[PDB]
């Protein structure tokens, strides 16, 4: 069940480091590289 709900794409992508998104600010669902668990802070609230 876990594999069939998550494993849906066959290349692992990454966002570019520049954030020129025209004004949108996805800073809360993007992963945070300052943590050992490279998770968004929303995931951190969910885990806490």
């Amino acid at each position: 069940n876990t594999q069939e709900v998550f494993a849906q794409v066959k290349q692992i992508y990454k966002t570019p480091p520049i954030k020129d998104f025209g004004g949108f600010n996805f800073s809360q669902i993007l992963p945070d590289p300052s943590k050992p668990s490279k998770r968004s802070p929303i995931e951190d609230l969910l885990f806490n």
């Binding site: 494993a7 794409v9 066959k10 290349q11 692992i12 992508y13 990454k14 966002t15 570019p16 520049i18 020129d20 025209g22």
Partner: protein, 39 residues
């Protein structure tokens, strides 16, 4: 020389795409594929 190995899974190939604010990729060719599915 055949034996049994253990490894960390590889999820998939890493692929970074050149995002910009003014660039669009448009396909030119196409393929018709047939896939099977069993229930």
């Amino acid at each position: 020389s055949q034996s049994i190995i253990a490894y960390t899974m590889s999820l998939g190939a890493e692929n970074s795409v050149a995002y910009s604010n003014n660039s669009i990729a448009i396909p030119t060719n196409f393929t018709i594929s047939v896939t099977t599915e069993i229930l």
